[PDB]
Amino acid sequence: GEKIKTVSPERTERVMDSVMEQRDQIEMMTEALSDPSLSEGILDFEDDAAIDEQL
Amino acid sequence: AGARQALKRRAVFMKRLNTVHNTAMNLQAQIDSIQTATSTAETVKAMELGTKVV
């Protein structure tokens, strides 16, 4: 009973909710930094036609 | 898919190559302009000397 009062179930719910929220924020931050639109940058105006013919 | 990736990257590199080559040609044009201005100044000086004598 002393242990259950110390680490209550509501406390575990709060901890797991915080873990979920922080995991979501890390995923969003680390996928924002990996957007291929930068290294791609300028895209074909012909929309891959030149690269199609090159392939 | 990897072949398309490599060909897109190559296309970017050739576009950069074209831009660099055109910039070097523009610098050559500026050098030629400097030398042409020098030659034209000497020609005008010679013509003015001859005009003074005549």
Side-chain angles (χ1 to χ4, degrees), chain A residues 39-40, chain B residues 3 7-8 10 12 15:
Chain A
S39 64
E40 288 181 353
Chain B
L7 286 188
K8 264 184 75 169
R10 182 176 159 282
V12 175
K15 200 192 102 87

Side-chain angles (χ1 to χ4, degrees), chain B residues 20-39:
Chain B
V20 156
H21 176 240
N22 292 11
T23 320
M25 293 334 302
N26 284 30
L27 291 184
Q28 188 62 63
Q30 187 130 11
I31 288 165
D32 288 349
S33 172
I34 286 160
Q35 278 151 14
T36 298
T38 286
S39 64

Side-chain angles (χ1 to χ4, degrees), chain A residues 29-41:
Chain A
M29 260 154 35
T30 202
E31 95 192 343
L33 290 170
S34 78
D35 201 345
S37 78
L38 286 39
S39 64
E40 288 181 353

Side-chain angles (χ1 to χ4, degrees), chain A residues 2 12-14 27 38:
Chain A
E2 293 177 350
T12 323
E13 295 302 320
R14 260 178 304 108
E27 162 153 52
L38 286 39

